[PDB]
């Protein structure tokens, strides 16, 4: 099965083979030989500038998002949270649960954030000390203007947090130039590794002032970072070593492909071809080509009264392709990712399977 | 060529690792029902033969699960008695402090078995206590605590009982219902011999059922995590370490093939006893007396020879194919040697030979 999902996805066989080893968490072979190498490569991958550092955290991407919210903000801080999808909404949900001061700016799932509106909010409330926004809303496949909001964060001197879970590694970006202080991302999406942990690449000057902020020991990003910094990459608690080995290999394959610039080109091409082919088959995209993220695409569900995603999905799977359900509140859609082990030939084979699975036609 | 004589991550079978060589779709039944539900069902049966219990899996290390229990199993007016006789008992106190959770810490030291009478007295004088938490196998020193007696105490006083069995579950027989344990926390990469990536809690449903809204953490909300698995056929709220989950399923299959906990336990304590005897024959002394030993890991006093360095001892052993572990005892310089994972009788023999060879200060 080819997983046309937003991740966990179809990893390369070499990435999987790298998991076939048992590592000792106290040994330098692992901490220096693997962990420190991953940290250094992540920072370099995020920016050419100095002053940044990486921290890895056990769990899913949401854990890292929660860790940043509870670690990057002090008891007198307040974060402006842009919400235009499930992941933006989850940050608002986390803030409310954790009792973190905030202001939610919701603009709809199919609406690009209004930068001027964000500018006004920041102007009317200087109490806002942080700005948080999702870069790639995997929910609808939309891409938010992290650059413009970043310029806004720099103008007002705010700490900028970006959830780049489904974009880092697949879309060119230099977080320093974007004025991003905390870049959050996944091990199993654009980088193409397997699930197990997430990471945050942060402006050291900012992170270094977060001691005591977290009320969670497990999710204390500062303590986690300090331990890696003082003990050659060592993780405070048990780390998913096998998945970490897989990540090191995924990073190497990313470098081999030609870096983010090359991977981005492949993803864009895959999508361009997929979309053209789907439209040729009568499907319609939820969003206009301008708002598209290059890792996934949302399509309106067929209007035929006989169409059922459950059946469409099963028939595609029977042919070896696994698509994804759509979770857009205002519209009935389904999604098709194009990252991971997906190349030109795969898109073509996918389209043939789609035509074949269109049982309602 | 390395054998990991550590508390975990440890040396797993080749088959447990090869079971990871598959990608899973987190939204498909093949994974959620075909693997997750299977695991949940097996974990509950492994912990007890009675009804009323359920399993919840959580992404992260074992400490995440411990924290999830502390933040999800307790209500607003609740208070937990935390017995501490090692780093893992101490971590629960540390967590309770950070989270602002009312608690009563009972610290009896890292080399002393907790006093059950003392715990009784505490329960008598501090009626606000509603929960009791204790580590079963204290990996800090290899100490094995009396979870049975404390459970009887908890039952007598009608208190909710939490047990951190991270390094015991799967390697030491136990029926949680009979031990009066309401929340059993354990690891996927220790006695069950799986791979790190997630941890789990086997709890009495009736107790967990009343924890809605307790957690201030979305990621660590045990109740929510459970309701999702319960309502959507093992589905994890957020992305799960699928590969490590497939490995755990294989680990469970191999546990059964060995003969279950009874058989694994037999292997483990025999390894441990042979190790202690051999090490003592080589001039080493155990930190604890036999009576307090657990069958999973043992702490030895570091030799006094001025030239001795754990770094060198460790490297020369590793060079021979054996990786041991450092000791972190507050009032004593020790080193540890675990005997779990893919460790068998012949391995202990080989290790002892390696030790002699590595004793460069003699
Ligand atoms: C933008 C974004 N944020 C968060 C997540 C959640 O990741 P996880 O399931 O690994 O917690 C996914 C995502 O695409
Ligand atoms: C008793 C006990 N508790 C907690 C842990 C910690 O596990 P982890 O490193 O997986 O969080 C280990 C352990 O042996």
């Amino acid at each position: 099965y080819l997983l046309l999902t937003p991740g966990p996805l179809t990893t390369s066989r070499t990435v999987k083979e790298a998991m076939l080893f048992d590592s000792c968490t106290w040994d330098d072979d692992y901490n220096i030989g693997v962990v420190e190498q991953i940290r250094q490569q992540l920072t370099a991958l995020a920016t050419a500038s100095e002053g940044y550092t990486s921290v890895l955290l056990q769990g899913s991407g949401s854990y890292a998002v929660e860790a940043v919210l509870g670690s990057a903000l002090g008891p007198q801080d307040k974060v402006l949270i842009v919400s235009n999808g499930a992941y933006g909404a989850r940050m608002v949900e986390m803030a409310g649960l954790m009792g973190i001061a905030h202001h939610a700016y919701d603009c709809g799932e199919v609406a690009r954030p209004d930068v001027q509106a964000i500018d006004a909010i920041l102007n009317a409330d200087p109490t806002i000390s942080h700005i948080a926004m999702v870069h790639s809303e995997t929910t609808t496949g939309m891409l938010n203007p992290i650059d413009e909001v970043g310029a806004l964060a720099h103008r007002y001197g705010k700490t900028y947090i970006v959830d780049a879970m489904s974009s880092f590694g697949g879309i060119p970006m230099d977080i320093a130039a974007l004025h991003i202080d905390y870049l959050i991302s996944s091990a199993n999406k654009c980088i193409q590794g397997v699930p197990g942990f997430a990471f945050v690449i942060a402006r050291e000057q900012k992170l270094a002032a977060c001691k005591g902020h977290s009320r969670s020991l497990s999710l204390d990003l500062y303590a986690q970072w300090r331990c890696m910094e003082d003990n050659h990459g060592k993780w405070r608690f048990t780390s998913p070593t096998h998945t970490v080995l897989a990540f090191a290999q995924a990073l190497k394959e990313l470098a081999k492909e030609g870096g983010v610039a090359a991977r981005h080109q492949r993803y864009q091409q895959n999508q361009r071809s997929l979309v053209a082919g789907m439209r040729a088959l009568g499907f319609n995209t939820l969003l206009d080509d301008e708002l598209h993220s290059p890792i996934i695409t949302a399509f309106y569900s067929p209007e035929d009264p006989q169409y059922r995603f459950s059946e469409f999905y099963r028939r595609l799977k029977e042919q070896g392709f696994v698509i994804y359900p759509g979770k857009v509140s205002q519209s009935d859609c389904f999604r098709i990712g194009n990252i991971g082990e997906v190349y030109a030939a795969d898109i073509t084979a996918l389209l043939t399977a789609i035509r074949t699975a269109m049982y309602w036609t």
Side-chain angles (χ1 to χ4, degrees), chain A:
Chain A
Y1 297 141
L2 179 60
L3 273 29
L4 297 313
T5 66
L9 63 232
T10 294
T11 53
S12 71
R13 180 67 194 192
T14 40
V15 158
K16 296 164 191 268
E17 304 186 80
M19 296 181 88
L20 302 176
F21 298 97
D22 288 310
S23 313
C24 178
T25 55
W26 185 78
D27 203 292
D28 286 347
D29 291 337
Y30 176 67
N31 296 311
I32 294 182
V34 186
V35 182
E36 291 293 67
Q37 305 316 307
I38 288 173
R39 299 183 66 215
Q40 178 276 174
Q41 287 170 53
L42 283 176
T43 302
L45 202 53
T47 181
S49 301
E50 285 295 294
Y52 283 74
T53 184
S54 294
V55 55
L56 316 181
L57 188 70
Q58 303 91 314
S60 64
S62 296
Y63 283 49
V65 176
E66 194 176 315
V68 167
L69 288 177
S71 303
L73 283 70
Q76 296 180 302
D77 288 336
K78 181 182 182 179
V79 59
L80 169 55
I81 302 171
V82 175
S83 182
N84 76 320
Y87 305 113
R90 183 170 295 168
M91 286 198 286
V92 178
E93 185 183 5
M94 295 178 148
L97 279 175
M98 305 158 83
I100 295 174
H102 64 288
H103 176 158
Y105 164 76
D106 189 344
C107 56
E109 290 178 348
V110 296
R112 181 174 175 299
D114 186 319
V115 182
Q116 303 177 67
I118 296 175
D119 175 56
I121 290 172
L122 289 168
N123 185 60
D125 181 22
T127 275
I128 295 175
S129 62
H130 296 241
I131 299 177
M133 184 173 78
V134 173
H135 182 196
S136 169
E137 257 296 357
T138 320
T139 314
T140 57
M142 192 174 293
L143 194 59
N144 292 321
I146 59 175
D147 60 335
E148 293 179 60
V149 175
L152 235 49
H154 182 260
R155 182 189 308 170
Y156 294 83
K158 308 303 180 178
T159 299
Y160 191 31
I161 302 171
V162 169
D163 173 350
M165 212 71 73
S166 60
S167 70
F168 181 67
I171 303 183
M173 74 180 79
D174 179 317
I175 61 180
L178 294 174
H179 306 294
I180 299 174
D181 296 299
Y182 296 90
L183 182 78
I184 310 167
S185 198
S186 173
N188 57 273
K189 292 185 185 303
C190 296
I191 303 292
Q192 300 183 179
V194 305
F197 67 102
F199 56 82
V200 176
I201 306 172
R203 174 113 57 187
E204 193 169 330
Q205 183 167 295
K206 286 287 180 173
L207 215 202
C210 297
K211 183 179 185 185
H213 283 180
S214 182
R215 301 203 79 222
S216 172
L217 179 61
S218 293
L219 307 186
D220 187 342
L221 201 64
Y222 175 88
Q224 183 88 328
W225 174 64
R226 262 296 113 197
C227 182
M228 294 192 158
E229 281 299 273
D230 297 346
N231 302 111
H232 296 290
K234 181 181 181 301
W235 299 63
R236 293 177 302 159
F237 313 138
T238 298
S239 63
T241 64
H242 307 264
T243 73
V244 173
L245 259 42
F247 194 68
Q249 183 54 46
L251 282 174
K252 294 178 184 171
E253 280 166 41
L254 169 53
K256 192 59 167 57
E257 184 176 357
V260 180
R263 182 151 297 186
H264 179 235
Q265 290 297 300
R266 170 163 64 90
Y267 286 178
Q268 293 194 91
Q269 181 66 86
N270 286 335
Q271 185 179 66
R272 232 144 49 211
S273 298
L274 176 65
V275 176
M278 290 291 283
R279 284 171 173 161
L281 292 172
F283 295 90
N284 301 298
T285 57
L286 170 68
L287 307 169
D288 291 67
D289 293 356
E290 290 187 58
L291 303 178
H292 286 28
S293 180
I295 76 93
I296 194 167
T297 308
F299 300 85
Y300 282 100
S301 301
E303 304 187 303
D304 188 302
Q306 183 188 176
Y307 170 77
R308 290 292 189 292
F309 175 78
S310 62
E311 194 57 35
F312 186 34
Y313 174 95
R314 195 60 177 277
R315 289 166 186 263
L316 280 177
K317 187 179 177 187
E318 171 171 54
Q319 300 179 71
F321 304 86
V322 171
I323 56 177
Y324 219 56
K327 193 178 185 303
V328 180
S329 181
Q330 186 177 180
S331 301
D332 199 306
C333 296
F334 68 87
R335 290 174 292 165
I336 300 181
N338 54 263
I339 63 179
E341 291 312 89
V342 178
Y343 297 76
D346 300 302
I347 295 299
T348 294
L350 204 207
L351 292 169
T352 299
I354 291 287
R355 189 172 69 253
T356 304
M358 290 181 80
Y359 68 92
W360 61 92
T361 58

